[PDB]
Structures are given as structure tokens and as C-alpha cells.
A = this chain, B = another copy of it.
Amino acid sequence: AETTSMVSMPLYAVMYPVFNELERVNLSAAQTLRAAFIKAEKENPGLTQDIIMKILEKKSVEVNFTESLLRMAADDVEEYMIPEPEFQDLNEKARALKQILSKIPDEINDRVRFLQTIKDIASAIKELLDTVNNVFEHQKKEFVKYSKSFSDTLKTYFKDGKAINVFVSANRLIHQTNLILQTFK
């Protein structure tokens, strides 16, 4: 506590929380990475800080990457395709939602087009919701959670102007849709 430098704080304030969240997904990876960061930090105080700053400086790469995933999500046209009417409706709704979500980076640079896109996305989410209700619950609550999270992300975007948040939330909503399609399969 009193022996560890102040510069080593980002380890425990940023890296430790991440490693703890990872400890549920994979204990070995979390433990290994944590050990590496501890070694590196003790041998070189203020290293984790420099790493995080270096990451913040290469943020454009991450924006380009997330946007790339969002655009390439269009190639997931008929992936995870499920033999019954409601199943058809389901497939079409999921497809339409993912397809309209993949076109976000095109419309986000124009307020009008982006707003209309928000309209269409809202309609798609509502229709997919109703269709899910037809097919009928954890995946549902997940989808809703990430949906309202996407809305709140939009709310945050209209203040900030950072498109990367929207891209990430959209990608997560798409991933959720895919997960639900897997659950149905």
C-alpha cells in the first residue's frame, strides 16, 4: 500500500477490474495476464499507465475495427438460419434487424439519414420482439438489455459525438440476435 508507487494505480484501478471480469470467462487467461502485468509493473513502475495511454492513443484503430465489424456484419445475410411459418417470420426479422444495423456507419455522418435509420431500427427491434413473443427467456432479457443499452448509447452519442460507442453497442446487439438464433436452433 504505502510501498507501491502512485504511478502503479492504473493496474489496480483498470487492469484488476478487467482481470476479475475475465476470471469468470477464463480463469487461466486472467491469472496468466494478471501475473504478467504484476511482474512487468513491479520491475517497471508506471508501465501499465504507459500501456493504457498507448492504447488510448491508438483509439482510431479501434474505431475503424469496430466499424469494420459493423459493416462486415452485412455479410451475415443468412447465417444461423433455422421449417415453420413463425420460424420464417423470425428469420426475416432477425435478418432485417442485422441488415439495418450494418448500415449504421453509412448514415451516422448525416443527422437526417441517421434519425430515419433510428426509426427503422426501432421498428425492426419492435417487430423482432413481437416475433420472439410469437415463438414463445434469458436471451430475451439479454436482447432487451442490450437494446435499451443501445438506446442509452444513442443518448450518450447525441451529447458526445463518439460513434465508436454506437458501433460497439450495435455489434453487441447483433451478437445477441445471433445467440438467440442459436438458442432457437
Interface residues of A (CB under 8 A from B): 6-7, 9-10, 13-14, 17-18, 21-22, 25-26, 28-30, 32-33, 35-37, 39-40, 43-44, 47, 49-59, 61-62, 65-66, 68-69, 72, 164-165, 168, 171
Contact = CB atoms under 8 A, between A and B. Distances in A.
A176 to B, nearest CB: 13
Copies in the complex: 2
Contact of A33 (B36, B61, B65, B165): B36
Contacts of A165: 57
A62 B10 contact: yes
Secondary structure dominating the interface of A: helix
A17 B61 CA distance: 12
A49 B175 CA distance: 12
Question: Would you list the 8 A-B pairs with minimal beta carbon distance, nearest first?
Answer: A29-B40, A36-B36, A18-B54, A26-B44, A14-B58, A53-B168, A32-B36, A33-B36
Contacts of A13: 58, 61, 65
A57 to B, nearest CB: 7
A22 B9 contact: no
B40 A33 contact: yes
